[PDB]
């Protein structure tokens, strides 16, 4: 490409909405897994 070329993405807004949906659900699964992990490690130490 000579110098800098402008390029345009297809459906960027819809892709952002689904990205937010996947990230937020993925982050919740991190909290749920962490909560269960600490629950077991609370009992194991106790």
Ligand X SMILES: CCCCCCCCCCCCCCCCCCCC(=O)O[C@H](COC(=O)CCCCCCCCCCCCCC)COP(=O)(O)OCCN
Instruction: State the residues that interact with a second copy by CB under 8 A.
Output: 2-6
Q: How far is CA 6 from the centre of its chain?
A: 29
- Written as six digits, the tokens of 37 are 């992990």
- Strand, coil or helix: 20: helix
Q: Give the nearest distance from C-beta 15 to a second copy in angstroms.
A: 23
Of 8 and 44, which has the nearer Cβ to a second copy? 8
* Least CB distance to a second copy at residue 2 (A): 4
Tell me the number of residues near ligand X by CB under 6 A: 6
């Amino acid at each position: 490409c000579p110098n800098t070329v402008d390029c345009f993405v297809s459906r960027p807004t819809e892709k952002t909405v689904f990205t937010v949906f996947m990230i937020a659900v993925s982050g919740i699964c991190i909290l749920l897994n962490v909560t269960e992990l600490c629950y077991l490690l609370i009992r194991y130490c106790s």
